[PDB]
Amino acid sequence: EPLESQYQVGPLLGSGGFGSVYSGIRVSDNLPVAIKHVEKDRISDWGELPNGTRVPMEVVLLKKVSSGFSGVIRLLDWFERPDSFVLILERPEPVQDLFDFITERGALQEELARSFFWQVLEAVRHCHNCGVLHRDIKDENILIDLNRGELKLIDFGSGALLKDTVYTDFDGTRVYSPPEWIRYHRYHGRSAAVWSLGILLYDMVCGDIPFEHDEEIIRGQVFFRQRVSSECQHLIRWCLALRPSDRPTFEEIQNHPWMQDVLLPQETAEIHLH
Ligand SMILES: FC(F)(F)Oc1cccc(-n2nnc3ccc(NCC4CCNCC4)nc32)c1
Known part of the structure; x- marks a missing residue:
């Protein structure tokens, strides 16, 4: 799977209303990342990308702000699973x-x-x-x-x-x-x-x-x-x-x-x- 092969999972950083967040690395260039899991059943606000795909509102919003540099955490990628979505985010260190x-x-x-x-x-x-x-x-x-x-x-x-x-x-x-x-x-x-x-x-x-x-x-x-x-x-x-x-x-x-x-x-x- 494109998730498990592109990224190497580390320690759980936290869990709560936002789901479960893990430390991780992109295997290619060893960029540090955060890996955030949200269960679909636990999602309240849905949004839609320009194309047909229905995603968590969070993904929509992150794509709107994740352009260029800023004081906003960058969304690097996302994946859909049967019961959840997984977000790949920038991780300072x-x-x-x-x-x-x-x-x-x-x-x-x-x-x-x-x-x-x-x-x-x-x-x-x-x-x-x-x-x-x-x-x-x-x-x-x-x-x-x-x-x-x-x-x-x-x-x-x-x-x-x-x-x-x-x-x-x-x-x-x-x-x-x-x-x-x-x-x-x-x-x-x-x-x-x-x-x-x-x-x-x-x-x-x-x-x-x-x-x-x-x-x-x-x-x-x-x-x-x-x-x-x-x-x-x-x-x-x-x-x-x-x-x-x-x-x-x-x-x-x-x-x-x-x-x-x-x-x-x-x-x-x-x-x-x-
Ligand atoms: F702290 C880390 F940078 F290591 O973790 C990251 C890196 C990039 C993004 C996040 N995100 N993005 N949304 C989040 C929602 C909750 C969350 N919880 C763990 C944090 C632990 C310490 N800071 C507050 C919450 N982290 C999130 C967390």
């Missing part, structure tokens, strides 16, 4: 997700959080550009290429095609979901994304997410548990405005005073990762 990174480091220095957050913004802009809404932005779905200091977005399994009309479905992470989802089961793509970016930024500079319960999300009152500059607090509170239309655009986020003078990825690595 060495690598660590941002969740684990924050677990080990605690709250991030603002200089480091600025660099990370900037790269997340460019990746998300890229997705929206390609007509893709990720819908599950959070520290676990962000990989750090430790050598290069480059961040990479992963797991489009809760994603959707970007549209200008309302969304009434959501299967991403609840504590990163906006108050309009909690209260009305309605949200629009960009402003729901910006809310989750606000959660992420708080997570980075405080070492934990700001809200646990539905009622806290709805109240939208932000308490800073760690020392954070006034400019950073302001950006966070702006992303977390209760009224969707009160939140910044990607452009306003990147023109914010706190976002100025970002480090390059490589110097971020030299100063903070090496």
